[PDB]
Each structure stands twice: as structure tokens, then as C-alpha cells.
């Protein structure tokens, strides 16, 4: 039972926060590059139910556009796309 990463597509404007959800050590990946881990602009917050996790990009930049996923250690999730439109 690998984790689930959503939304499959998230489009935000530069300046706002891009928040994903990983449901299931938990690692946030963007080959894979580790962004954050549970327990900078990439923060991971556990939800009250304990099984869901908010993975937010505080003040998303244009170059943050790409594919993201989360993995539990190494079972990985599907890849979600983030788009950051110019302002």
C-alpha cells in the first residue's frame, strides 16, 4: 500500500502557497530530490487524523513548476504536476 499524492495537478500564481496532500519516515520528493521529511519554503504538516500530511510550498516561484511525489521509507506515490504562473 504505497502512499497517495494529490492533487494530480495544482496551478498556483507566483507568491501564493502550493499545498499538496500525502496520505499514508515520510519524504517529500520533487531521479528524486528530497524536499522535506516528517518529522525553508517546503514544510510538512501532519493533519489531525494523523494519516494525511500537508506538503506546502510557501511563496511558490516560477521555477518550482515540475513533478512532485511522496515516498515512505522505499514505497513511492504517483507523480503530481505543479504549475506556477507568472504574475
Amino acid at each position: 500500500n504505497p502512499p497517495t499524492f494529490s492533487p494530480a495537478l495544482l496551478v498556483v500564481t507566483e507568491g501564493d502557497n502550493a499545498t499538496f496532500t500525502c496520505s499514508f519516515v515520510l519524504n517529500w520528493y520533487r531521479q528524486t530530490d528530497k524536499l522535506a521529511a516528517f518529522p525553508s519554503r517546503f514544510r510538512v504538516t501532519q493533519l489531525p487524523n494523523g494519516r494525511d500530511f500537508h506538503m506546502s510550498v510557501v511563496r511558490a516561484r516560477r521555477n518550482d513548476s515540475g513533478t512532485y511525489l511522496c515516498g515512505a521509507i522505499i514505497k513511492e506515490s504517483l507523480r503530481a504536476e505543479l504549475r506556477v504562473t507568472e504574475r
Partner: antibody, heavy 117, light 100 residues
Framework: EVQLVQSGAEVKKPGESLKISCKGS????????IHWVRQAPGQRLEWMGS????????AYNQKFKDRFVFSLDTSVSTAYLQISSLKAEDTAVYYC??????????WGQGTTVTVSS | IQMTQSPSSVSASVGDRVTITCSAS??LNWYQQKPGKAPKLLIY???SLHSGVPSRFSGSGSGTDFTLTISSLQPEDFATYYC??????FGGGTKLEIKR
């Protein structure tokens, strides 16, 4: 828990119109793509296209461009496949599938479409 | 962007190891479909097993060649298998039948 239920079988005439429904349950419908796949009788699977419940992102196989249209209903969590100017070559089994931009991880049970005079 | 799924059909017995190949001309997903039923996702990202897929299913990929392997065949594994790459495109399909 993740279920995609499609509408019943469709028996139409050449030149009519139909709209297959695809209601998703057990997940946030607005967070995942909806893909559409066609399988002619005894043939292989062929990807028709996909549509996302937000931002208006749609992708179409070039064979099913202007005659096949995808629609969505976010507040009710239902996907739609409408086909106009129906032809006899459209007789196939049409699947809707939840997934991402590149994969289909949960499939509907399918809808058999028969078009004949 | 031209993939070829081989072979068209495989005959094997319960307990055998079966390898299905999809080769390109210049990641891959694998699906399983039984007669009259909807397909199921088996492998994503070339080698990651989907939720609920038994560990006897495994995938690998080296450049232009990708293989789906079923280590020990069970009675439930006889079906048709499709590889899919990404516009999404399915392979030709491989029917796995019972040998006798």
C-alpha cells in the same frame, strides 16, 4: 473504497447522440484526472483522452478530436463522455479511469456502446 | 515514439516464470485485463507495484527495453497484459494462456 460507476449500455442509431456518465466515489473527485479508453470488440485498449476537473486541461488522441467531447461535474463528482454524429465504427466498450497525467490507477466497470441501423 | 509489445501470446503452466517485453524504437506502466472485465493497474514508474498487486509481479527497464515478469504463475494470472507509455499509448497486448 475508490469506485467509478458508469452508466448502462447504450444502443443508438447511426447519426444519433449519447453521453456516458462516470461518477467517482471514495476520493476527492477534483484532485485526479479522468481518462477515457475505448476497446473495440476483441481488440486492444486505445487511449482516447483525458480531462482534469480544474483549469480546463484536456488532452485528446488525434483520432477522437472533434467528434468526441469530455465534460465534468465537480460539485456532483461525475465525468461525462458525449459523442455526436454517431457512426457504426463507434461500437466498442468505453472505460473511464481515474488517474494522473500519465497513468490510470482506478478504472470504471465500462460501458458497452452498440451503434447499428 | 513507437513501442512493440512481444510476444502476442504466451502459453505457460502454473508455477512458471513469464517475461513480457515492450521495446521502443528510440517510465512505463503495465496493466492487466481479464475477459469481460475492466483493466487493472499493475506496475507504474517501470518498477513500482500498485496497491494490492502481489510481489510476484515485477517490472524493469533499461533504456528502450522494458520487461514485465511474473515469477510463479497463479491460476488468477492468466489474462491479457498491456504496457503503456507517455499523449498516452497502450502496447499491442499480450495474452497469457494455459499450456497443455
Amino acid at each position: 473504497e475508490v469506485q467509478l460507476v458508469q452508466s448502462g449500455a447504450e444502443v443508438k442509431k447511426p447519426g444519433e447522440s449519447l453521453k456516458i456518465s462516470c461518477k467517482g466515489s471514495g476520493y476527492s473527485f477534483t484532485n485526479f484526472y479522468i481518462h477515457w479508453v475505448r476497446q473495440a470488440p476483441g481488440q486492444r485498449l486505445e487511449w482516447m483522452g483525458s480531462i482534469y476537473p480544474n483549469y480546463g486541461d484536456t488532452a485528446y488522441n488525434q483520432k477522437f478530436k472533434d467528434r468526441f467531447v469530455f465534460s465534468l461535474d465537480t460539485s456532483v463528482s461525475t465525468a461525462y463522455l458525449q459523442i455526436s454524429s454517431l457512426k457504426a465504427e463507434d461500437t466498442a466498450v468505453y472505460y473511464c479511469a481515474r488517474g494522473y497525467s500519465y497513468a490510470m490507477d482506478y478504472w470504471g466497470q465500462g460501458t458497452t456502446v452498440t451503434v447499428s441501423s | 515514439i513507437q513501442m512493440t509489445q512481444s510476444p502476442s501470446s504466451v502459453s505457460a503452466s502454473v508455477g512458471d516464470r513469464v517475461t513480457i517485453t515492450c521495446s521502443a524504437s528510440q517510465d512505463l506502466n503495465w496493466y492487466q485485463q481479464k475477459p469481460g472485465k475492466a483493466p487493472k493497474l499493475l506496475i507504474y514508474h517501470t518498477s513500482s507495484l500498485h496497491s494490492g498487486v502481489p510481489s510476484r509481479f515485477s517490472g524493469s527497464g533499461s533504456g528502450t527495453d522494458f520487461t514485465l515478469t511474473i515469477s510463479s504463475l497463479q491460476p488468477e494470472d492468466f489474462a491479457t497484459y498491456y504496457c503503456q507509455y507517455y499523449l498516452l499509448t497502450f502496447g499491442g497486448g499480450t495474452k497469457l494462456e494455459i499450456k497443455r
